[PDB]
């Protein structure tokens, strides 16, 4: 079917080059990656402590 | 009647789609804030350094004024 992993260079001229250069000069996308686990901290953990709570099973 | 496992369609979950999208910063917009913070940064910092000069001369004046020391 072919999905293709290669993007064949997203940058071309002026507008497409400068924004791709801005993320490599400072960070931006790493701060975007930093914010990915920020929301993960905010949501409740799906944790079960054994001596009191028990896990799901089958008949 | 014999009952078995039933099928469900509705929306079919929607498989294979790019959820990643650019947010907040575009490119040209963040540089205006970046250099803008620098221009505000140096201007506000040097005003305190000029205010330090008012103290600097006056502090060293104490040694000149006091000769019985």
From Swiss-Prot, chain A:
Disulfide bonds: none annotated. It is found in: Mitochondrion inner membrane. It comes from the Eukaryota. Core subunit of the mitochondrial membrane respiratory chain NADH dehydrogenase (Complex I) which catalyzes electron transfer from NADH through the respiratory chain, using ubiquinone as an electron acceptor. Essential for the catalytic activity and assembly of complex I. Core subunit of respiratory chain NADH dehydrogenase (Complex I) which is composed of 45 different subunits. This is a component of the iron-sulfur (IP) fragment of the enzyme. Interacts with RAB5IF. Belongs to the complex I 23 kDa subunit family. This is NADH dehydrogenase [ubiquinone] iron-sulfur protein 8, mitochondrial. The lineage of its organism: Eukaryota, Metazoa, Chordata, Craniata, Vertebrata.
Curated annotation (Swiss-Prot), chain B:
Coiled coil: none annotated. The chain crosses the membrane at residues 27-46. It is found in: Mitochondrion inner membrane; Nucleus. It comes from the Eukaryota. Belongs to the complex I NDUFA13 subunit family. Accessory subunit of the mitochondrial membrane respiratory chain NADH dehydrogenase (Complex I), that is believed not to be involved in catalysis. Complex I functions in the transfer of electrons from NADH to the respiratory chain. The immediate electron acceptor for the enzyme is believed to be ubiquinone. Involved in the interferon/all-trans-retinoic acid (IFN/RA) induced cell death. This apoptotic activity is inhibited by interaction with viral IRF1. Prevents the transactivation of STAT3 target genes. Complex I is composed of 45 different subunits. Interacts with CARD15, but not with CARD4. Interacts with STAT3, but not with STAT1, STAT2 and STAT5A. Interacts with OLFM4. This is NADH dehydrogenase [ubiquinone] 1 alpha subcomplex subunit 13.
